[PDB]
Design an enzyme around this catalytic site. Structure first.
Site, mmCIF file in Angstrom:
data_model
loop_
_atom_site.group_PDB
_atom_site.id
_atom_site.type_symbol
_atom_site.label_atom_id
_atom_site.label_comp_id
_atom_site.label_asym_id
_atom_site.label_seq_id
_atom_site.Cartn_x
_atom_site.Cartn_y
_atom_site.Cartn_z
ATOM 1 C CB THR A 1 -1.094 0.112 1.233
ATOM 2 O OG1 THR A 1 -2.099 0.843 0.701
ATOM 3 C CG2 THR A 1 -0.505 0.576 2.685
ATOM 4 C CB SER B 1 4.314 -8.265 1.861
ATOM 5 O OG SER B 1 3.834 -8.127 3.042
ATOM 6 C CB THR C 1 3.613 -3.299 6.697
ATOM 7 O OG1 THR C 1 2.107 -3.573 6.788
ATOM 8 C CG2 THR C 1 3.681 -2.171 6.313
ATOM 9 C CG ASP C 2 0.513 -7.781 6.336
ATOM 10 O OD1 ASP C 2 0.384 -6.864 6.737
ATOM 11 O OD2 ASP C 2 -0.450 -8.565 5.605
HETATM 12 N N1 LIG Z 1 -1.337 -7.213 3.299
HETATM 13 C C1 LIG Z 1 -0.912 -5.892 2.633
HETATM 14 C C2 LIG Z 1 -1.388 -4.835 3.675
HETATM 15 C C3 LIG Z 1 -0.837 -3.436 2.998
HETATM 16 C C4 LIG Z 1 0.602 -3.046 3.424
HETATM 17 O O1 LIG Z 1 0.907 -3.149 4.437
HETATM 18 O O2 LIG Z 1 1.215 -2.472 2.457
HETATM 19 C C5 LIG Z 1 0.747 -6.093 2.280
HETATM 20 O O3 LIG Z 1 1.422 -6.434 3.279
HETATM 21 O O4 LIG Z 1 1.254 -5.804 1.300
#
Ligand SMILES: N[C@@H](CCC(=O)O)C(=O)O
Ligand SMILES: N[C@@H](CCC(=O)O)C(=O)O
Ligand SMILES: N[C@@H](CCC(=O)O)C(=O)O
Ligand SMILES: N[C@@H](CCC(=O)O)C(=O)O
EC number: 3.5.1.38
Lengths: 315, 313, 330, 330
Positions: free
Chosen positions: A13, A45, A78-79
């Protein structure tokens, strides 16, 4: 003459090609570095694969080796940011800065954190102070170690924390340092991406009340070469699970005791289980997903449990 | 006049019950204490049968006019799971405190002696009535709902994202917050009506994870699966199909996370929970979410009801 | 074989005593001699050759600059001895942080120096000082501790003497650093995770051997409706530097700024710290025009830390630019 | 269909402006009026019917007692109005926590009152104020906020105004409470996990409608080698109470006790707080004989918070035992 920084984009994101949008949307980067961008992948991610990690790791190595690259920024969801960051910290034999960065708030949202996060990442990647410090993460005005920073808080911008504290902060483009790493990383690592062509399969099973051996056995039957036990407490193992782990070890599956107690402390060898007698390994302070990364990398080199323990004590 | 406090011992390195009590003669100044040995386990090895037995005993004792409060001594590894379970199923206003020790009582500077003193102190205190189950370690009064073992080795192990509710110092309790979530007397659940607990299991999310653990756990009896996802209960693309399949096969799917220091998992954010008929675990860590799901499934299998429950308890 | 460790006792709760085992909070500080403290931990003899000295017997809230010098000079004398491998100071917790920082600035040795106290007296149930002292002596005896600067070993943690501070009252986890613990100490074993980045001990420009008497430095608090009274009075009664414990980023009320300008003109250094002590730092030229005014920012240092650094720095310089460099290096 | 919310602007970084997007730290506070604040967030229309008023335009480090009274009286007038469902105050972060506690004590209403600031100006990249303000208006418009006391809604948290403090400099997670956030505000929606225990608002014995001018209360700091000079000077210049910002558990140096005893006998209230602000509290009769000396402990309240309570309390009483009760209830 400004630093030359390459941004390697992977998704998340923070892209709010994604990398082209970033380079177009944050024109302030030009104040602090000569940026260019490459889209290594475009993924959420949580869905990252080991093949993704290898591609990324190989690319970062190529760039690091170029005279025309001064520092590298990796934009990421971020995950699993913390897993990529540790991976790179183990396999990239370079003193050039490597920074990993994402956004907690959706990148187009009101007051979203990503823009300043990215500006800070490029600042840090362009700073002489960053050389030789290992992989860094630059979220919440902080400089965190990619080794032991984790996504610890959901939703909030302060999400990324380490038990051992931030090493520094980044404010109006300037880096202020308070601590240095102690653990082995980057140019002092025994591991090198340039020699790694595949990664062994490693899986993670959780411990909790009334847990059985089912997940452990199933994960091994579907290819796991190590099992990261995410135990209660000090890597504790239920008496219903210990026999399976003994059987799996004999069958050649490394057994690494981590925990879901991840704000601080570490898992102590021979405390809760007789690791020596069973030929098991403790993950020290490393959370389960960090432990998996280390185990995977290490097992490209060795399947000697004593060496694996050394590794888990040095990295 | 002194409160009548019963100590229910279950194990841990805070440890018989008669030794614990004899080890803290000062208890006699603050309460009239009796002991019972419910069990003697390492808490990582606890079973649902053990939880059921402990819960039923606590309800029996809470019904006695000769019991004013109840202290449960416990291993720290699953203390948090026991405390939450009791907070759900015991419909009493009498104080219920769960306590352990991060160091053995034989160790230098062991924490258990004062922990146990403080537990007895809180269990005898009128201020504790109607507060839900409490945990009294590190001079704090923590809610059993959301306190969790978060730091290994160190005596400050038990933390809550929502903070301590109070402190206990020289036998006196000092309160600063009140619970907001449903518990004990205001619970819809009652141990006296529960004879069976459904099987609930937990699987971990990480890079390159597959659907293997989830399928296997269902195959071996799981009625609900708690997904310990990355981030906001996020689910790998490699796992979503299996989770849909397992939901249609009747397995409840509950999205928790391994992001446990704060925040919560938002419905419909990372995954389409309405479309898939999944549930989010709110702020509850995976082992807490397991406990709630198991208790809730004594009463309902309606995923909408389950979601309500996860938003109220 | 075993390290020779000297324990210099100075008072505190660690040497305290209460009327009963339930008195963990209400007790008398600074009652017990060092030889009694050693005798309470027989296990020390397993890990080191220990001996004690009683430097002083005070409640640390009542420490003086003269007491700092006394302690600091005795530490120097021991560090210069062939027969000493490491040093442990037992201390009250109230100003433990101030002493530990002071020693980190002025002791030009790589021999381990460890400062330790306890939040409960040794008479209390679950008293913390036994294990704290054991761990102190363990750390002081460990080769890993050499060149790490002054350490504090409370609550199973290895903290830097620079920026650890008493942050939580009552509880045994009282001592915290914005930058984290550097390690832990468990079954007397030291496990490291971080290294210092700031100048200390061996690499410090300062040396207790040179210091005869410390300059007078005082602290005034910032809050709503604050006036210039405390600043002026403290300077009238000898302060050579004022540490401003401001709100926010060392912010100064408009009611206070003029006084501070006049004090600086009259040769009083003006150092902007804050009472926002869990993280972050005070940024030069942000809240006030420090270059215009010839003021100094204390960086991450809390007021009482800033005071110790101010005093040590003023033994060498009266140049505010230099003082600022010092606040950025140490 | 929508709640009527009034925004009262007082200044702050939330109303600040720097020279370039990258000026997140070095900028001018209190430059933008309320109309522009509200214009910067057109999404407010979705969630409430908002009107704005400019009460003052200040950097909050320079706030006065006059200004608190003026603000408190305007909040009261609005609270009494049928046309007002909730109130937001935009404020500088440096003394936000003082204002929010003041309001918690003196505003006898269940209508939501929210105090909000920002750590970065609106001109900055990733500025925090827009969402903070959105979330303040949402919380002020939410039935769940009724009866909860004054709230602070920064960093997606619902914090009690009683005990939230500015604890972290620079970062957007500045505001912390030892007792935790009470909830979170996300996608406009409030999620509660804890309730207040302490007395506030409609259950308060205090009322801003009775207060004509606040008593003078000042703060002095404790540290090594501290003297009685600040305490005496502050008292000479009008302090009716002194907040002692002690080391540790409100500990007092033996060089300061005699002056505090003299001051209490001359009618000055003596309140023992501390600079140990992450957790714990100051225990009566522990570090000093409070009953003998007729002193008061500030319990868990930090110095600037204790100052606010003491000022309010002293509009009703000069009895030290009633003041102590108040420090134990609010
Ligand atoms: N699950 C998404 C959440 C958005 C983010 O943290 O960028 C990711 O990890 O890509
Ligand atoms: N794993 C043991 C540790 C001992 C203890 O915490 O009491 C248990 O939880 O029972
Ligand atoms: N205030 C006393 C006792 C407190 C303690 O040592 O913890 C001192 O600092 O010496
Ligand atoms: N010092 C200014 C700006 C700081 C802020 O609001 O964040 C104030 O408190 O008004």
């Amino acid at each position: 003459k400004l630093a030359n920084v390459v941004i390697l984009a992977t998704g998340g994101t923070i892209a709010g090609l994604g990398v082209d949008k970033l380079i177009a949307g944050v024109p302030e980067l030009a104040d602090i570095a000569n940026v260019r961008g490459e889209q290594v992948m475009q993924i959420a991610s949580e869905s990252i694969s080991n093949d993704d990690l290898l591609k990324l790791g190989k690319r970062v190595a190529e760039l690091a080796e170029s005279k025309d690259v001064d520092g590298i920024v990796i934009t990421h969801g971020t995950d699993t940011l913390e897993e990529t960051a540790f991976f790179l910290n183990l396999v990239e034999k370079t003193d050039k800065p490597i920074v990993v960065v994402g956004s907690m708030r959706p990148g187009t949202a009101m007051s979203a954190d990503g823009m300043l996060n990215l500006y800070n990442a490029v600042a840090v990647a362009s700073d002489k102070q960053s050389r030789g410090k290992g992989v860094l993460v630059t979220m919440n005005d902080e400089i965190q170690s990619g080794r032991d920073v984790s996504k610890a808080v959901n939703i909030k911008t302060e999400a990324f924390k380490s038990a051992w504290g931030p090493m520094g902060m980044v404010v109006e483009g300037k880096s202020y340092w308070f601590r240095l790493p102690a653990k082995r990383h980057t140019v002092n690592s025994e591991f090198d991406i340039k020699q790694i062509s595949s990664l062994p399969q490693v899986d993670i099973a959780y411990g909790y009340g009334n847990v059985t051996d089912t997940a452990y056995k199933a994960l091994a039957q579907n290819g796991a070469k190590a099992l990261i036990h995410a135990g209660t407490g000090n890597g504790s193992v239920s008496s219903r699970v210990v026999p399976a782990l003994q059987e799996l070890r004999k069958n050649g599956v490394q057994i690494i005791r981590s925990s879901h107690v991840n704000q601080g402390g570490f898992v102590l060898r021979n405390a809760e289980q007789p690791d020596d007698k069973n030929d098991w390994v403790v993950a020290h302070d490393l959370n389960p997903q960090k432990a998996r990364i280390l185990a995977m990398v290490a097992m490209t080199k060795t399947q000697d449990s004593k060496e694996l323990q050394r590794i888990f004590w040095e990295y």
